[PDB]
Structure 1
Amino acid sequence: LEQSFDNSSLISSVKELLLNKDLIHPSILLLTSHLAHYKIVGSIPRCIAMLEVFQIVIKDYQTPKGTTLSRNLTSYLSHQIDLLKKARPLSVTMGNAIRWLKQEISLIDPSTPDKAAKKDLCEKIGQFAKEKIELADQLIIDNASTQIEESTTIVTYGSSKVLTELLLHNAISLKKNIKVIVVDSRPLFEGRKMAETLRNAGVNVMYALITSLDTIFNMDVDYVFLGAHSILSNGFLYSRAGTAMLAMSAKRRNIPVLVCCESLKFSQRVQLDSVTFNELADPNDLVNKNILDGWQELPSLNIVNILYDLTPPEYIKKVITEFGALPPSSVPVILREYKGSA
């Protein structure tokens, strides 16, 4: 109660909406129970999953009697959004996809016989997942592969989103020597998902933990890469928690820090303090007769966890996006010149 941060209402832990007011798609109930119960995702996996379940929910139209397709679908899809809003708070890859999707719903005209609706929404959202995600990531690979010399190391963090393919490309498709160090954190052990895939493909993975973060950097080490959840308007990064400690340790021990991001993921909003806009994530996960049971019913005890916190832009040497490399203080110029306009 001294800082009162545990009563931050940016997430609501209410569950079990039983209301049959709308036709909630059973696939989207599978998607929400797949997100919120056992988190299998990063950010662009959530974006591709949300996008290819909205694919199915527009393919299964079921239009009402007197309402045109241009006058129902945004409210229907917003009530589809509300279940994910209950499940897990949204990324910017959520938001900059759904507002684009609503803008593309808006420019349809009341003459579609609900047969070309597929041909201008399914194909167009496939062009979105092609353009603003996948070939953009292909440009990320082809832009960041020239900035890695042979026989070096890489320290990623957590589950990567795009640069798993970068490490696989520079490991196998370009055959230059590389020694990836993957480090992750309690409780979402999502660096192991990178470690299984990278070592299954046959690259020198050396897993670690973030508590032992000192002894990684005392080896021969350079080129810390970082997956991003969003990049703010100032230059502050925003990603899975525990990123910023190895960011400040990496800048402290004068070895460079990079962020592989794409122009879909830049955000309009602004913050500079870490615990301001943030997600509380289910404090029963930090236990696994257990070690302790019942932080409740014991007065004066609490268990907190944080998913998201900010590296200051002094630490990131280079944000790379599909247009090119850039200093992190110069992200509003791609907020204004390229995001949305491309």
Structure 2
Amino acid sequence: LEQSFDNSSLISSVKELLLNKDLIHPSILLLTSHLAHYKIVGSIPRCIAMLEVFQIVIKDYQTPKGTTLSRNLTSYLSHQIDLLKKARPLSVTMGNAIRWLKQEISLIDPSTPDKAAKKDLCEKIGQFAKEKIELADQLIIDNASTQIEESTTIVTYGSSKVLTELLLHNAISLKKNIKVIVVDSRPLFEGRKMAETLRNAGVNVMYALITSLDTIFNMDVDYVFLGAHSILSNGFLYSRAGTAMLAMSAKRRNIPVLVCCESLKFSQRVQLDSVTFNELADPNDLVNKNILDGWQELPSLNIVNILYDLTPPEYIKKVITEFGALPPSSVPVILREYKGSA
């Protein structure tokens, strides 16, 4: 009660809707069903999957009689976003795409016979993720590869989002020697997906848990690379929980730390505290007859499960985007030069 972070109302556990005024897309319920019951995403996997259902749901237009297609879809698509907000609040990978999409709703005129409404939207929103994601990730590949020598180590955290493809390129598409250290944490064992993949790729993978983190650093170790969820306007890395403890330690143990990221994952907002702006996710998950049951109904017990947390930018040495590399204090200068400009 003294910190009262349990009464930080960033999320509730509300469910069970029945309303049928909107024609709810059945497949967008599947997307929310695939998130909230068991999380299967990073952030750019959402930015793919949020776009996967959007190409389908615009194809079923269902434009009514006395309404322009500019007038209904700004309500029709945005009503379906609140289904996701019941499941999981948005990211900036969510956020920067959808406001760009709401521009495209507004910049059309009453001239389209709804047959032309596909290809002016379909390839355009396809060339979004073709440019802003795919070949944006291509420029990640050449930039990080020249900053990695052979016969070294990489320490990652959680499931990566883009540097999985980077580790595939340096182990197979360039065949230089490399050892991989993947560490994830209870409850979301998403780093095991990388641990399956890179040894299916056939490379030296050492799996790890965050409680045993010191003895990884007591060996020959360097080049700590990180996934990301958003970068603050200061330089704080808003990312998956438990990122900063290796980010403080490897910076304390004088070997450099980088964050693989992109310009789409920037943001205008700013903060400097970990427990201010976050999300909780269903406190039943940290249980597994069990050992304890009854965080409810029992006096003086609670289960927290932090999803996102900030890292100080002094821990990060170099921030790499698709345009290049940059020091972490110099993050917000792209916000005036490329994001909404490029």
* Helix, strand or coil at the partner of 1:153: strand
Residues 1:194 and 2:194 aligned together: yes
* 2:76 alignment partner in structure 1: 76
Q: Deviations over 1:94-136 (max 9, x none)?
A: 0001011101111111100001110111111100111111110
What displacement does 1:301 show?
Answer: 0.8
Overall identity of the aligned pairs, in %: 100
How does 1:45-64 map onto structure 2 within 5 Å?
45-64=45-64
Q: Deviations over 1:34-54 (max 9, x none)?
A: 011110000000110001111
Contact 1:317/1:327 (8 A) holds in 2: yes
How does 1:218-257 map onto structure 2 within 5 Å?
218-257=218-257
Taking the aligned partners of 1:303 and 1:68, their CA distance within structure 2 comes to 49
* Helix, strand or coil at the partner of 1:72: helix
Taking the aligned partners of 2:142 and 2:27, their CA distance within structure 1 comes to 35
Q: Deviations over 1:116-162 (max 9, x none)?
A: 11011111110011111111011111211110000000000000000
Taking the aligned partners of 1:193 and 1:90, their CA distance within structure 2 comes to 23
Larger mean CA deviation between 137-146 and 205-214 belongs to 137-146
Larger mean CA deviation between 123-132 and 3-12 belongs to 3-12
Taking the aligned partners of 1:13 and 1:295, their CA distance within structure 2 comes to 15
Contact 1:152/1:222 (8 A) holds in 2: yes
Contact 1:158/1:189 (8 A) holds in 2: yes
How does 1:168-207 map onto structure 2 within 5 Å?
168-207=168-207
What displacement does 1:281 show?
Answer: 1.2
Taking the aligned partners of 1:107 and 1:11, their CA distance within structure 2 comes to 34
What displacement does 1:28 show?
Answer: 0.0
* Helix, strand or coil at the partner of 2:3: coil
* Helix, strand or coil at the partner of 2:179: strand
* Helix, strand or coil at the partner of 1:335: coil
What displacement does 1:182 show?
Answer: 0.1
RMSD: 0.7
* Helix, strand or coil at the partner of 1:208: strand
Contact 1:157/1:226 (8 A) holds in 2: yes
* Helix, strand or coil at the partner of 2:67: coil
* Helix, strand or coil at the partner of 2:286: coil
What displacement does 1:70 show?
Answer: 0.9
What displacement does 1:89 show?
Answer: 1.0
Taking the aligned partners of 2:315 and 2:18, their CA distance within structure 1 comes to 47
What displacement does 1:13 show?
Answer: 1.4
Contact 1:223/1:258 (8 A) holds in 2: yes
Taking the aligned partners of 1:13 and 1:124, their CA distance within structure 2 comes to 37
Contact 1:42/1:160 (8 A) holds in 2: yes
Q: Deviations over 1:48-86 (max 9, x none)?
A: 000111111001111111111011111111101010011
* Helix, strand or coil at the partner of 1:117: coil
Structure 2: gaps of 5 or more residues: none
Larger mean CA deviation between 8-17 and 51-60 belongs to 8-17
Taking the aligned partners of 1:17 and 1:133, their CA distance within structure 2 comes to 34
Q: Deviations over 1:247-288 (max 9, x none)?
A: 000100001100111101100000001100001111000000
What displacement does 1:10 show?
Answer: 1.4
Taking the aligned partners of 1:319 and 1:201, their CA distance within structure 2 comes to 27
* Helix, strand or coil at the partner of 1:183: strand
Contact 1:59/1:122 (8 A) holds in 2: no
What displacement does 1:198 show?
Answer: 0.6
* Helix, strand or coil at the partner of 1:216: helix
Taking the aligned partners of 2:274 and 2:120, their CA distance within structure 1 comes to 41
Larger mean CA deviation between 11-20 and 149-158 belongs to 11-20
Taking the aligned partners of 1:100 and 1:322, their CA distance within structure 2 comes to 20
Taking the aligned partners of 1:9 and 1:44, their CA distance within structure 2 comes to 26
What displacement does 1:12 show?
Answer: 2.4
How many residues align structurally?
Answer: 342
* 1:281 alignment partner in structure 2: 281
* Helix, strand or coil at the partner of 1:98: helix
* Helix, strand or coil at the partner of 1:34: helix
> When the two structures are superposed, what TM-score results if normalisation uses the length of structure 2?
0.99
- Runs of 4+ in structure 1 deviating by more than 4 angstroms, as ranges, are none
Taking the aligned partners of 2:11 and 2:64, their CA distance within structure 1 comes to 33
